[PDB]
C-alpha cells in the first residue's frame, strides 16, 4: 500500500511537470501578446505599403494615379506617418519600449518553445525571423524612396537611417539573443518501409576531392532511396552554387530496414576539429550490423579550399570507440514487422553547409532512427552576412536540382534539346501561365528530346515531371517505350515519381513529350535521373563456380532457377576454425544441400523464405558443395535470389 | 490510515486536473487576445462601413450628402484606407502575421472549448464562424464598389480580390482546421418526474417507410413527453424539408424514470456500419429493465433512396457475441422518491441528418438519464459545403413545427383556415409591422376554423400557442370546448406548452380564437398534435374473461371498480416452474388473491398503493385465478389501476 | 508518521486552492485585456471629447476657434469618425464583437473578484460601472449635437440612437449580468477602542412615524459615537432628500467595546417580509449582554407611505430565537485588552434605502464585529431607474449633512445668521477659491453667529469646520468661550472634530469666526451638532437614598466623592431568591461596606477599579446599606463613578 502511494505521488509529480510546462507556454504567449500590442499597427502598414508598391520597387493612368495618391499619403509628414511606423517598428525590434523588452527576445523565446516539427535549429529559425523583418524594413525604406521620387520631392537619403536600424537590430541579436544554442539536427520525418537481412549492403557518400558533402535526401515515392548532396566549397564554409549534386542511391530501405531480425546501429557523435570537412561518409551493413564511416579532410576556412591530404578518420561509429576503439555500444533493435521508422524526407541543413561532426541517435524504444550532425554554420554565417558582405547563402534543397532531361525546367521560352514538333507544341512561356514555361501541346502538340544516350542498359532511372493537362510522356527508343505516361489529365500540375530498369538498349530512348492521343497538355520540370541499384559486401559464394545438373538455369540476379529435376552445386571451401553465414532467399519451393563428400553439414527444404544458417566452426574435408537441389518435379521453379554463404 | 492517504491523493489528482483544464482555458484566452490585437481595428471599421451603407448595398439630400462624404473617406487611397483594413483582415484570417497564427485556428480552439450549451457540432460552429466573416468581407467589397460608383470613380473590379481572399480562407479552413471532430449528441438538461414501475412501458420509435428517424426531444412543461421527427433522406446524407413531421408520445418519465423501485437500463450502444439509417427503434422496459430494440435500414448515400432491404437488428445483443450473460451490458438507477433525472429538452444533432447509431447513456451517479444517437452530420456536410454545391442546411428545431391547426402561426395576410368574421377583427399587422404573424380580435373578435374532422375520440393531445393581450382561445363545436384560454393578459406573445385529452366525440370541434373582452387581442403559433398513449407489453390479463362478481363493472383505465364489496375474477393458469409478477395499484381499499384450491399462495390486502410481488415456485394444482376484491366498507369503491400479471 | 503525512497533504491541498484562486484572477485579467483591446481607443476618444467640450455642454475668440476646429474634426463623416467610436463603444458594451463577449460581463466578473475593500454590493458596483459608461455615452451624443449646432450643420436627432444604445445595454445588464447577487453589507472598517462593563447602556435608533431608518454612522475622532440616519420615504422605497437626519449618540465604544470581560452578542438575520421597513432599532447592553431590537412597520411600496400600525417584531437577536424564542446562541468574546474591533466608518448602503432584514455576524475569532442587513434596493431601483423614470437616487452619506450653524456650508455668497463684521470679513464666494464660499477674514475679518441658543447646558456637542488659513474659531457666550480654535494655520482646508460639554449657561454662545489675532483666514462647512451622552439601563442603587457621614460630597456624575473621614450609605433591599450585580468604579482609594445590620455581605477595599461583585441569592434581614466608606484620611478622595447594585 505504501508502494501504491509512492506510484500515486509519482503520478502527481508528472501532472505538476505538465502544469509547469503549460505555464511556460502561457507566459510566453502573454509576452507575444505584449510585443504584438507594441508592433502590430506598424507591421501591418509596412506590409500593405510594401505589397502595394511591388511593381515600382521591383489602366496605366488609373493605377499610376491610384499609386500617386498612395505615395502622397506615404511621404506626408504627420505624427501618424510612414516614417513614424518605421521608427516604432525599429524601437520595438531593439527594445526601446516603455518596459525594456525586445520583439527579437519574445520571438526567440517563441521559436525555442514551438520547435516541435521544425526542420532546422534555434539559431537558424531565430535568424530567419530576423531576416524576414530586416527585409521588410529594407523594402519599406526602398518604397519610401520610390514614392518620394515618383512625386518629384527631394531625396532624403534613407540609406543611413536604414543601415543604423538594421545594424542595431543585428547587434541586439548578436549580443542578447544568439549566445543561444547548437549545430545539431536530424532527418525531418520517419517512415515504415521494409529492407533486407541476408544482404550485405554498403553505401558510400563521398564528395569530389574538390567537394564536400552538402546534404542528404531520402525519397520513397518510387522506392526508398538515398539522394546525396555534395559540392565544391567557397570561402568561409560557403558553397559554390554550381557543382552541387544529388546522388541517388540504392534501395536505401534495405540498408535502413531489417526483415524481422535484429540490427546493430552504433551510436557516436563522430566529430573532427574545426576546418575539417567530411568529404566522404561510407555506410556498411554486413550481417545486419550496419556500420558506416565518417572521415573529414581539412578545409582552410578563409579561401574555400578543402585540404586534400589531411584526412581525419573515425573508422567506428560507436561512443565506445571514442574511448577504446573496441567495437561495442551499438543500439540493438528487435525488428518490427511493418518496418522500422526509416528516415523520410531530406537530411540536410536549411542552408547547405560543411558539417564537421555527426552522430547517430537512433531511438529503438520507439523503433525510430534519428541522426545528429555538427556543422560550421555559425562559423560560415558569422563572417559573411553577420559582417554584411556579398551573401552566398543558399536555402536547403527540397527535392531535385537537375535532370537527365536538358532544360528540364523550361522557363526562358526555349526548348534546348527539346523539340517543338508542332505549332501547338510551341514553347509558350505562358503555356497555361507565364509563371513558368511548361511546354504547351494541345490536340497535336509534341515536344521530343533524346534522353536515351544517357539512359544506360540494365540500370534503373528516376523520373519526375510537373505536368498540367493530359501529357503524352514517353521514354521511347522509337521501338520500345521503356516507360510512357499518357494516362492522367492534370488541371493543376501534379507531379509524381516512378522507376524503370533501362532495357537492354535504352541508348536510343527519345523523350517524346507529346500532347496526347488528343487533349490539352502542359509540362515542365522534367526531372529524370539515374536510380542507383544497391550494392553489397562480399561473401564466399560465387555465381560462376555453380555446377548445373540439368533443367536448371541461372538468371540475371544470379538467381539460379531450379527448372525441375536438377541443381547447381558450387565447390566451396569451409575450414575448421571459421564460421559461415549461409544466407539465401528462394522463389518457389525447393531444397539446398551441402554435401561435403558424404556428410550433411546442411540440408533443409526451402519453400519461400530467407535462409540464414550460420554454419559454425566446422572443418569441411576436401571440398564441400551447396547442391542447390530445389524441388524435383516438372513444374518446379525454385528461383533463388541471394547466393550468400558469406563467411563469418 | 493509508487508505485515507490514498483518498486524499485522489482528491489532489482531481484538483490538479481542474487546474490543468483552467490552464487550457487561460492559454486559449491568451491566443484570442493575440488575434483580437491583430484583427479588431479592421473588424470594427468593416462592420461600421457595412452597417452604415445598408440601404445602398441592399432627409434624402442630407443622407445622400453624409453618405457621399463617407464614400469619399472609404475610397481614399491612404495607408489607413478601407482597402488596407480589408487586406489586414484577410492576412490575420489566413495567418500571414508576424508569428504564423491564424484567426481561424484560435476561433476553432475557442469553439472547441466553449461548446458547453451549444446546439450543433464543432464543424458546424467553426464553419458558421467562417461564414459570418466571409459574408462580412463580401459585403465590405460590395460597399466599396457601391461607394466608387456613387462618387463616379472608375470600376476596379474587386470580384477577383474578394474571390482570392474568400477561397484562401476556405482553403485554410479545409486544410488546417476541418480535419478535426465527433458526431455524438445528447439531452441538454434533465427532469424529475415520478415515472412507472407498475407498468411495462414499451415504446417504438419507427420511421416511415421512406424516412429515417431524425431526432429526439424530451418535454416536461406540458408533461414528460417524447417528441420525434422523421423525413425522407435526400442524396448526400441530407434530409428533405417538406417530408419532415412530428410524433409525440406520452408519459416518458414513466418510460425512463422509475418510481420508488430501481430501474435497469440496458446501456446498449446499437451502432451500424456506414450507409445504415435507423428506420425503427423500440424502447423496452419490462420489470424496469430499459432495453431497446433498434432496426436500422441501409441507405444509398447518393440519390437518396433509403434501401428498405438491408436491415440490422441489434436489440440488446452486443454482448451476446462475447458473454452468456447477455443480460449484462446495463446499469442500475435507484428511484428516489421524487423521480429520476430523465432527459429534458432534446437529444438531436445540430443539422438534420440520418442517425446511424444509438446508445443508452444514463448516469445514476446523478440519475442523469441521457439518450445518445450517432448521426451522419459529419458526412452530411463534409461533402456538401466543403464542396460548395447546394448546402441544403436546416438546423435542428426547438419547438413544434407540425400542428393540426393549419396556418398554425400564420402564413401572411391570409388565414384561409381561420375566419376573419369581423372587419375590425382583422389581422393586427398583416405585414411584418407587429413583430411576428399573429391573429387579432377586438370588441367582437373571432376566428373560426373547422378541425373537428381532425380530432379523435379519447386521445391525448399536446397544445402550444403564442398569445398577447386579451385573447379568448377556444376549441369547440359550439356545443362543448376541448381547450380554452381567455385569461392572463400578458405583455408580448408568451408561449403555452400544455396538453389536453380530445373529447368523446370531437368530430365537429373547431377552433375559435376570440377576444378575452372588449379589448384588443393577439395570438399565434397554434400547435395541436396527438400524444401517443403509452402502450405496454402484453401479459396474460385480458379484461374480457373477467367475471364481475358483485356490484361491479369493467372500467376505463384497466381499473375494475369494486362498488362497495364484491370482486373481479378470471382464470389465469399459473405454472409450477414459472414466476409471475402481479403489479397493480388500487383506488380504494382492496384485496388481491392468489390462492390455490385450499391454501393462500398469497394473502395480501391493498388500500390505495401499488403491489410488487415476486412469487417463487407456484405449486400449481390446476386452479389458479385472482379475485380482485375490496373490503367491507360502503364508501370506498375499490378501483384497481393496472392489470399486470407479467410472466417472468 | 502517517498523521504527519496527512498534515503535509492538507498543506498541499491548501497550496492547490491558492493556485486555483490565482488562476481565476489570471483568467479574469486575460478577459479584461480582451475587452480593453476592443474598447480602449473609443473610450479614450469619447473621454477627451467630453472633457474638452465641458463649458459648451455645461480668451474668447481663441478658445472658440480651437473648439470650432475640434467640432469640425468631431462631426466629420470618416471611417474613423466620432460616430464610429460611439458605435464601436456600444457594440463592445453589448457584446456584438468577433467572439461574443460583452464588456459588461468582464467588468461584472472583475468587480465580483476585486470586491475586497468595497463598501457596497456586487449589484450596486456593477450598476455603478454601467451608470458611468451610459453617462459617458450620453454626454458624448450631447457634445456631438452641440458640435453640429456650433458649426451650423443640420440636426440629425441623436436622441433615438442614444436611447437605443442605452436601452440595449441596460437590457444586456438586466438579462445576462444582474441575475447576479444579494442585498447584504456591513460596516466599512474596524477600530480598537475601549468601552465599559459595569454600565448598563441602551441605544435606540427609531425613525419618525413618517420616517424609516436610512443608515448609520460611527465616528471616533472626538470619541467613538454612533450617528443615526432616518428620513421620510418616497414611493418605491425611495427617500425624501429633506427630512434626512443624522442622530448622534453616546460613547458608542462603550456599548460596543468591553473592559477585559466577556460579551454576549446574539446572532440572527432579523428579517421581516417585504414592504416591512425597520423604522426603529433599539440596542440594549445589560451586564455586558448586549442585545438590541429590530422591528419593522410596513411600507406600501407604491405610494411612499410607511404603515404606522402594522409592526413586525423580533424581540431577540439570535438565530436560536428564530426557531425557539429561547435566548441562547449568542457570540461570546473573551475581551482583548487594547479594544474590540469596533465598527469604524459609516454603516449604510451606497444609496440610502429601506432595509427589511438585518443580521449580526460578529467574528470573535478575530475579535471583529460584522453586521449584515437586507434592504429593498433591487425593489427600489428596479422600478424607477431601470424603468427610466425621474430618478430619486441619492448617494450614501459620508459624513455630516447639516449643522447647528445655519448656512454652515456657506456656498451662495451669503452669511445668513453669520455676521460679516469687517470689510475683510466679506462673504466672498471666492474667499480663497470660488469652488466654495469659505468666509474670508484677513488681518481684521470676523464672521459672528449666535449658536448658543441651540447650545444647551450640561450637554456635549460635536464641531467640525472646513477652514483655510488660521481662523479664529469661537464658541463664546461673550463671557466664557466654551471652546475656541485660533491656533492652526491651514493652507489646504484642514477639518477636524472635537467635543465640549456645554457649560452651565451656553444659551448665549455666539460663534465668532473671526480671522485671528492677525492672519489670513477662510472657512466653511461649520458642522456643529449635539453629542448625545450615552444612557444606561436601571439598577437597584439610587443617587438619592445615600446617607453622607461627614467629609463626603456627591458630584455631577452621581460620583459621591469620599472627601475623607465619612461615607455614604444607602438602605437597599436585598431578598433571598434574588441576585445582585453590585458594580462600581472608583477614583481614589477607598472601601465599600454592605452592613445589613450586623453581617458583612460585602466589604472590600477599592483603590481604582471596576467593582463587579454579583451578590448571590442572599436574604438581607431588614435593610442593608452599602456604606461607601472610602479611605479615612484627610487627603482621601474616593470618587466613585457608577453606583450600580443592579439586581440580577
Residue numbers in the entry:
A (entry chain B), B (entry chain A), C (entry chain D): 141 to 198, 214 to 803
Sentences from the paper on this structure:
The Vip3 proteins have molecular masses of ~90 kDa, and are secreted as soluble proteins that form tetramers in solution. They can be proteolytically processed by trypsin or insect gut extracts to yield products of ~65 kDa and ~21 kDa that remain closely associated in solution. Vip3 proteins are proposed to exert their insecticidal activity through pore formation, though to date there is no mechanistic description of how this occurs on the membrane.
To investigate the structure and activity of proteolytically cleaved Vip3Bc1, we performed a trypsin digest to yield two primary digestion fragments of ~68 kDa and ~21 kDa respectively, which we term activated Vip3Bc1 (Vip3Bc1act). Mass spectrometry analysis indicates that these fragments are formed primarily by digestion at K205. The structures reveal that Vip3Bc1 to VipBc1act transition requires extensive conformational rearrangements, but consistent with previous biochemical analyses, retains its tetrameric state8 while opening an approximately 5 Å pore. We were not able to directly observe density for an extended alpha-helical bundle in our single particle cryoEM reconstruction of Vip3Bc1act, however we were able to use deposited Vip3Aa16 coordinates to generate a model for Vip3Bc1act EM density due to high sequence identity (59.9%). We observed that Vip3Bc1act associated with the membrane in an elongated ‘open umbrella’ conformation, ~15–18 nm on its longest dimension to the membrane, with a stalk interacting with the membrane and the bulk of the protein density distal to the membrane. B Scaled comparison between segmented density for a single particle in the tomogram, with 5 nm scale bar (i) compared to Vip3Bc1act model (ii) with an overlay showing the stalk density fits the 4-helix bundle well, and the density which is distal to the membrane is consistent with single particle Vip3Bc1act model. The helical stalk modelled in Vip3Bc1act does not account for all of the stalk density observed in the sub-volume.
